[model samples]
Target: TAFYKAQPVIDFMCEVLDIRDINEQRKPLTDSQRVKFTKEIKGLKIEITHCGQMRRKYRVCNVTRRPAQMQSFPLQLENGQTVECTVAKYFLDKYRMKLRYPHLPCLQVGQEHKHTYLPLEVCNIVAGQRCIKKLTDMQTSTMIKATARSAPDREREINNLVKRADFN
Candidate 1:
């Protein structure tokens, strides 16, 4: 097949172009979320659900604090009055509505400065929140060792992982 004949060229070009398989695929730290992130291990990768409902992993460079006050979205009243209220308070006052996780912190997201911050609970991380952060290296080391094994072991692990029908 032409594909077989082109394999060598493809592999060579992949290396040159820095293309890597999904398995091999490899932040600013500022603000509240960023401050919170720094409390974690550097170069830590986290899987998050994108707006598209697709999961993609991103490396954390820093953490930040989610300001309690920022929870409120500013309001512009019909009479040209500006009202600032916490989302929780706003809902309660306007519709007598109560929101869960009203106190969750916002994560400093993206490497951009003071631009992006996401509420903790709103982030899918709330689902099975995986924070690579930890205290005492001993605690983190025993659990799963972050990722496992050298190349030989890695491939062996993959080989072992496939049980019939593992992939579709």
Candidate 2:
């Protein structure tokens, strides 16, 4: 079985954004800083799904506000009509979870809401460190062939064919 970890882009984000202390007292990030940071970390992407369990890509629109259990604010639509919206409630209703990791900064990358934003620092691409090494073409092909078996049959196949293959 293979398990993956967060990528280095995310770790770089944490480092540049000083995310080590989620509870630290710091002023809000400035606009220039956000823009420069985002530009510097271009091509960084994070796959955010419902409850962080799904396997679909979520769009990240913007990054604003602190992550909390309840956040109520007024939003202006494209027509310039201001509406009240609460993000915490939205996530709970949509994902059935109370927004775990509320303190871990949010990267709002979806269309469910308009004018959303995600902090450049929270996107897995920015905050994730690439701990895993890049696989060679042959290695990748071999692994794909080895794991192509059906789910129910994978265990036995792995045991017989790859259990002692010295992958390390």
Candidate 3:
């Protein structure tokens, strides 16, 4: 993960801000360099604990400059209810924070379709929190196999006929 590679940068920011732990971090990434570093990291792990439920984990896939200005899909509520929804609206309703820059891209593990996200402004990586740990070779292989949807699924293969057509 790029976040792993950027650990030094994040550590530097922690030092500069004297943020010994995640509990002391603030939002909007006031520092320009920190913002740049966060952008480079691009992904984060969000841990959630409900009142009576076990803690759950989610992976951030992509990070944008701010909240998505538009809605990707409409919402259908229970009781036969439906409403227009935007990314900003969803976060506002759930997390109570207006969308801000330095947002993390998140993918819920099991429920990939669920709207799962965490604002860097609120859930900064806690020092010694161990958001990421070294994976064993088998675990690494599994992750690669599970997430490797880009090549075959998203990319098209060019056949000899197509290649020859292009030349002609």
Worst 10 residues of 1 by lDDT: 1-10
lDDT tens digits by residue: candidate 3, 16-80: 45667644443434446445545544455544432223444454444334434343434568876
- Name the regions of candidate 2 deviating beyond 4 angstroms: 1-5, 8-10, 25-27, 58-86, 93-123, 126-168
Q: Which stretches of candidate 1 lie over 4 Å from their true place?
A: 1-38, 50-52, 68-99, 111-115, 121-168
Model 3 residue 165 CA deviation (Å) reads 41
**Which is superior by lDDT, 1 or 2?**
2
- How does model 2 fare in lDDT? 0.48
- The per-prediction tally of clashing pairs is 15, 23, 6
lDDT of each: 0.38, 0.48, 0.43
Across 22-141, the per-residue lDDT of candidate 2 in tens digits comes to 335244456664564455543444544344554433334555546534456554568857777766566567656664445444455555554443332334542343343446465344
Error of model 1, residue 32, in angstroms: 14
Best-first order by TM-score: 2, 3, 1
Candidate 3 clashing pairs? 22-126, 22-127, 59-107, 60-105, 60-106, 61-105
